[PDB]
């Protein structure tokens, strides 16, 4: 039993065995493929809330077993006691506690297993901030500020994740309500349009409704909305000297800087769920650095986002009569050129989509040579511009779900009964 | 049971019931997705009976005659034939219906809003390669229509025992030749180098130029394939120029206007039509992104970037991206100027979203392959990018088949 993937530029074939260790459903069947569904499956590893012992322990025994095999100590003295130790905690607390090394292993391996991440060649170079001692929203704000400041590192960005206490009964969850630590506000206008970032309108309204005083500009950094041990969330303002921002200019078009555009330097995903041996860390903000397309193809150019193509085209003097002039395509390129050139000018880490995609091909090779496989989601790996002129477009990929993992989770306002 | 797909740009939600009617593999398992795998002797009497029943039932349902007197007589007729002859023959009505639906069911095709407007040429009376050449010439002339292209397919005799297959050995009816040089370089189209060697061996005397139309290699009834030169007056060609860069014409570039796919298999009710060339018209990016800029292809980015004085030292200047756009602008401007039918990728994807919605309304779903529907450039600024799509295999369908020089056992000398 194998499966081969082939790269149709280079004719390199790769033999995948790692997929035999797949645990969760992808959503597909032999009669239907769901590889372009956003959230295809709802196959979770334990039931919704406080699991019984025979539900939680088998997941724990798997993770510990996997960790001790990783370090060539399977069945060793330490491993056997660790099993017995996790049994006692589950028996007396209906949960258990990860060792500091187990916690680091798991975070790095959830990144490694993130089939959608084009960036995983860095997976083992992740800094882990243990914040499992935290108890309040103020403490969360302290931990998050240190995260942001370490990771920003004056622009030489560093990957980090900060791990808050795990879910216990489902009522005492820790949650960052922000989807990223640094996003811009979006404002519903009287004339029906949208000022700022339309993705965040709803979140911006919850902030205003929670007492935030909006500047009502186009690039207003949003407050943090931190929730600790299930209490009501609390607004904090990130100290601006911690929010690195790049003004976007263009190496050719001098008029570009007059579009009054900037973006933040640190992408810090903060609404996902980290799962390790059946433990669920509902607040695990992680951050690395941007691929240029993320800002310039999606953030600036989606219709339901900043939607700035029309403006950039006008200033370029393009025939916007019909689509066949390819005026969107042209403007779209000049933008991502401008974004790259600006980050590089301010010595802020950023990677282009040719470098990133090439990296990931190399990562694939490494993973197949040393691990027998590497899960990859072609729909998400291929950059959203210039797909076929990058090497991943011609790379076949197998997609399967390995644990530890990052998972989606409901937005907390759909589920939070206030006080 | 139902399934939902969402458009994350518009928030439209469609409900797929049609997926229940599929019964072929996708290659995916319940624990592994093969969505990006490119490609994941003949049927006995027993295997053919149900296949034919499914198709006949579907046809008669389609014309609001299910369970009718004509329906049951046709079904009993098909049975007599499989009993007697171990195969059966489609009526003309069923052949048209089947060929139209295989296009409709082609999950990888973004042009399916046009599916019901398809001209079917019945060529099941054909017996020789000369016969095939005649049929293909009439296909090309009808489809090209002086630049106002019309979709058509020509269907040759179905498979029998596998020993008497009809095959077009060309992958398209009109492609340019490729020639490896002693110094390793390549003249013409690198994609076709192998097929070029085969033709040259079979006796074709090549011009050894950059845009030589390859000869047809036609196999009828399991015999050795035979060479024919498509009459040059039937090959409509477009010289590629750019509306702003006057230096572009000096690249010497041209393309053929008629995409005519000939290496595939058409399956209707268990019958396999191993030779079924079909044609429509181009999306610009097929020539412009893939045919010129793929590195295993004509590979003209560097030359275009040079003439643009682009900074080609570092990727992050995005010279490849910038050059690719201009080449695609030229392709579209060239065809539109010569009034040859073509569709740009924005128009194409827009129409496909419209077609998908209509198909969910009146048919209960529409199988689609995101990995193929999204254009190979500027993906996220076309609406299919944000459109969730279910993939499953309806039949009749088009199908891959092995290249005939891998399996043909030669006859002469
Ligand atoms: C260091 C440079 C990194 C780059 C360039 C990068 C790049 C990307 C990009 C472009 C995406 C697609 C996201 C989108 O388009 O919305 C993605 C997905 C993802 N990345 Fe990475 N990433 C990096 C670091 C990390 C780190 C440190 C982690 C976790 C520790 C991570 C985990 C993930 C996950 C879980 C997803 C899937 C998210 C989802 O399904 O919404 N990445 N990555
Ligand atoms: C009328 C205009 C049409 C347009 C603009 C169009 C567009 C396209 C494009 C761009 C592709 C991807 C091709 C590739 O990337 O290699 C494709 C695939 C395909 N098309 Fe259409 N098409 C048209 C008509 C037709 C017709 C008339 C048929 C058959 C009757 C057909 C059947 C298919 C099939 C079977 C595929 C998938 C091919 C494969 O699996 O390799 N198309 N189409
Ligand atoms: N470089 C980076 N970037 C990056 C990486 C991972 C994830 C993201 C953000 N990804 C969110 C995309 C998304 C996911 C789920 C839904 C969704 C919402 C509600 C229900 C169901 C699904 C919607 C979206 C919006 N497209 C950015 C980065 C951040 C940290 C390290 O690296
Ligand atoms: N507009 C059109 N275009 C179009 C439509 C359908 C199909 C194609 C050609 N599609 C070829 C892609 C392909 C498929 C399989 C393999 C392959 C090779 C070896 C082993 C297995 C598979 C290689 C390729 C080349 N990429 C073009 C068109 C033609 C007729 C009407 O409309
Ligand atoms: C490996 C990968 O599936 C392959 O390169 C695919 C991707 N998507 C494609 N999409 C289209 N339209 N045509 C293609 O040839 C391909 N090739
Ligand atoms: C419908 C489609 O699956 C969805 O819009 C996906 C497509 N691929 C993507 N790829 C990345 N990197 N990010 C995305 O948000 C998406 N969106
Ligand atoms: Zn799948």
Coordinates of N, CA, C and O and ligand atoms in Angstrom, one line a residue, chain B residues 99 102-103 106 108-112 114 118 151-153 261 264 278-283 285-286 290 343 348 372 398-400, ligand 2:
Chain B
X99 N -23.9 12.6 -26.1 CA -22.7 13.4 -26.3 C -22.9 14.8 -25.7 O -22.0 15.3 -25.1
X102 N -22.4 14.2 -21.8 CA -21.0 14.0 -21.4 C -20.3 15.4 -21.3 O -19.5 15.6 -20.3
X103 N -20.5 16.3 -22.2 CA -20.0 17.6 -22.0 C -20.6 18.3 -20.8 O -19.9 18.9 -20.0
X106 N -18.9 17.1 -17.7 CA -17.5 17.2 -17.6 C -17.1 18.2 -16.4 O -17.2 19.4 -16.6
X108 N -14.5 19.2 -15.1 CA -13.4 20.0 -15.3 C -13.6 21.1 -16.4 O -12.6 21.8 -16.7
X109 N -14.8 21.3 -17.0 CA -15.0 22.2 -18.1 C -15.7 23.5 -17.6 O -16.8 23.4 -17.1
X110 N -15.0 24.6 -17.8 CA -15.6 25.9 -17.4 C -16.5 26.4 -18.5 O -17.3 27.4 -18.3
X111 N -16.6 25.8 -19.7 CA -17.4 26.3 -20.7 C -18.8 25.7 -20.8 O -19.5 25.9 -21.9
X112 N -19.3 25.0 -19.8 CA -20.5 24.2 -20.0 C -21.8 25.0 -20.1 O -22.8 24.3 -20.4
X114 N -22.5 26.5 -22.5 CA -22.8 26.2 -23.9 C -23.2 24.8 -24.2 O -23.4 24.5 -25.4
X118 N -24.6 22.0 -29.2 CA -23.5 21.2 -29.7 C -23.9 20.5 -30.9 O -25.0 19.9 -31.0
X151 N -19.4 24.9 -31.6 CA -19.0 23.7 -31.0 C -19.5 22.5 -31.8 O -20.6 22.5 -32.2
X152 N -18.6 21.5 -31.9 CA -19.0 20.3 -32.6 C -18.2 19.1 -32.1 O -17.1 19.3 -31.6
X153 N -18.8 17.9 -32.3 CA -18.1 16.7 -32.0 C -18.4 15.7 -33.2 O -19.6 15.7 -33.7
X261 N -10.1 18.6 -29.4 CA -9.5 17.6 -28.5 C -9.9 16.2 -29.0 O -11.0 15.9 -29.1
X264 N -9.4 11.7 -26.3 CA -10.3 11.2 -25.2 C -11.3 10.2 -25.6 O -11.4 9.8 -26.8
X278 N -13.7 16.6 -30.4 CA -14.6 17.7 -30.1 C -13.9 19.0 -30.0 O -12.7 19.1 -29.6
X279 N -14.6 20.1 -30.3 CA -14.0 21.4 -30.4 C -15.0 22.4 -30.0 O -16.2 22.2 -30.0
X280 N -14.5 23.6 -29.5 CA -15.3 24.7 -29.2 C -14.5 25.9 -29.5 O -14.3 26.3 -30.7
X281 N -14.1 26.7 -28.5 CA -13.2 27.8 -28.7 C -12.4 28.0 -27.4 O -12.6 27.3 -26.4
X282 N -11.4 28.8 -27.5 CA -10.4 29.0 -26.5 C -10.8 30.0 -25.4 O -11.4 31.0 -25.7
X283 N -10.4 29.7 -24.2 CA -10.1 30.7 -23.2 C -8.7 31.3 -23.4 O -7.8 30.5 -23.7
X285 N -6.3 32.4 -21.6 CA -5.2 31.8 -20.7 C -4.7 30.4 -21.2 O -3.7 30.0 -20.7
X286 N -5.5 29.7 -22.0 CA -5.0 28.4 -22.4 C -3.8 28.6 -23.3 O -2.7 27.9 -23.2
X290 N -0.5 29.0 -20.4 CA 0.0 27.7 -20.5 C 0.8 27.4 -21.8 O 1.9 27.0 -21.7
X343 N -12.7 33.6 -25.5 CA -13.3 34.1 -24.3 C -12.1 34.4 -23.3 O -11.3 33.5 -23.1
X348 N -15.4 34.0 -18.8 CA -15.6 32.6 -18.8 C -16.1 32.2 -17.4 O -17.1 31.5 -17.3
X372 N -9.6 22.7 -11.6 CA -9.5 22.9 -13.0 C -10.4 24.1 -13.4 O -10.0 24.8 -14.4
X398 N -16.8 12.1 -20.5 CA -15.5 12.0 -21.2 C -14.5 11.4 -20.3 O -14.6 11.6 -19.1
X399 N -13.6 10.7 -20.9 CA -12.6 9.8 -20.1 C -11.3 9.9 -20.8 O -11.1 10.0 -22.0
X400 N -10.3 9.8 -19.9 CA -8.9 9.6 -20.4 C -8.8 8.2 -20.9 O -9.5 7.3 -20.6
Ligands
LIG2 C1 -17.4 26.2 -26.1 C2 -16.3 26.7 -25.6 C3 -15.5 25.9 -24.5 C4 -14.6 26.5 -23.7 C5 -14.4 28.0 -23.6 C6 -14.0 25.5 -22.9 C7 -13.1 25.6 -21.9 C8 -12.4 24.7 -21.3 C9 -11.1 24.8 -20.6 C10 -10.2 26.1 -20.5 C11 -10.7 23.6 -20.2 C12 -9.4 23.2 -19.4 C13 -8.6 22.6 -20.6 C14 -7.2 22.5 -20.0 O1 -6.8 23.2 -19.1 O2 -6.5 21.6 -20.5 C15 -11.8 22.6 -20.5 C16 -11.8 21.3 -20.2 C17 -12.7 20.3 -20.8 N1 -13.6 20.6 -21.7 FE1 -14.4 22.5 -22.2 N2 -14.5 24.2 -23.3 C18 -15.4 24.5 -24.3 C19 -16.2 23.5 -25.0 C20 -16.2 22.1 -24.8 C21 -16.8 21.1 -25.6 C22 -17.7 21.4 -26.8 C23 -16.6 19.9 -25.0 C24 -17.1 18.5 -25.4 C25 -18.2 18.3 -26.1 C26 -15.8 20.1 -23.8 C27 -15.3 19.2 -22.9 C28 -14.2 19.4 -22.0 C29 -13.6 18.4 -21.2 C30 -14.0 16.9 -21.2 C31 -12.7 18.9 -20.5 C32 -11.8 18.3 -19.4 C33 -10.6 17.8 -20.2 C34 -9.6 17.0 -19.4 O3 -10.1 16.3 -18.4 O4 -8.4 17.0 -19.8 N3 -15.5 21.5 -23.7 N4 -12.8 23.3 -21.2

